[PDB]
Design a protein around this ligand. Sequence first.
Ligand SMILES: NCCNS(=O)(=O)c1ccc(Cl)c2ccncc12
Length: 330
Amino acid sequence: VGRKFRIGRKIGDIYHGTNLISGEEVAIRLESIRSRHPQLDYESRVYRYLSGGVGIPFIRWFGREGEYNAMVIDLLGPSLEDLFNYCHRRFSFKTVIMLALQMFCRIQYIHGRSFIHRDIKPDNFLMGVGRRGSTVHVIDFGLSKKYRDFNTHRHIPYRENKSLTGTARYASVNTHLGIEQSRRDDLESLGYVLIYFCKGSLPWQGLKATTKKQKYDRIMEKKLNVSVETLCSGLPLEFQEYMAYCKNLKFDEKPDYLFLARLFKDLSIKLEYHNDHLFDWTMLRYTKAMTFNKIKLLAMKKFPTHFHYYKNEDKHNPSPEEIKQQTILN
Ligand SMILES: NCCNS(=O)(=O)c1ccc(Cl)c2ccncc12
């Protein structure tokens, strides 16, 4: 039903859909007019302005279908959180770095297009269905705002006392303080996600509360009490360096994107990694083609170079060479 793709299995408000014209697969969402505070049309406009860039979902059609407005995107495979779960909530350093690299360029592009995503969670990073199944795409711009005016490139004025949006686990510290969000906050959230991929957990998730605000404040307290080098407890120098730079950015200040890109790329070169686009889930699926704790042990012995991990008890800054000894182990 609908115009003019047919919606099917629920993957709501997101449903699996079929292009009747071609047979192409379609991810289609419809909002619920008029409650509560629907914004789908605005998001569709954001997509339209952002189109042309890599890792940007393509809106086939947006309009009003029957009662509800509908947005239509081509299918984009699993999120990085679903792949996170598929790899037992832990990524190898090669995957994390490669994900961080593409994520950098995607987020850079958005900032180049004068916007900021302001959500940045693994749930909002989807891979793709086919040939573009190696690329990383970005979704949900419902909270996105343009930070600089388009022609004049003038930054939006400084504001405070506002609420936080939207997920506290990956939220910036400044956002908890009710500070207007700049580019720096997108990058800080990104850093939180990278640690989330390395360790598999964050110090503030899994807390106790009686109300949303009390929940946010408790996460806020934990984030303030945790040092930068403490949360990068078993991670290389570049991981601390990234978070240090991002938290020390002015509101108006634009990030030196190439510096953070080189930061992770040089770390990759130190570790003798490559942009093979061979991720953890890729090689895990391949070995499984021939619980899953067995498969993981097998895949490591097959590709000893690729799989390097984080040890949960370590309070340490593992040298590139130290980590490269996990290769000779497997
Ligand atoms: N792996 C979870 C799948 N996410 S999904 O199908 O609901 C999905 C949600 C939201 C958007 Cl914007 C999409 C875009 C393209 N493909 C799937 C999309």
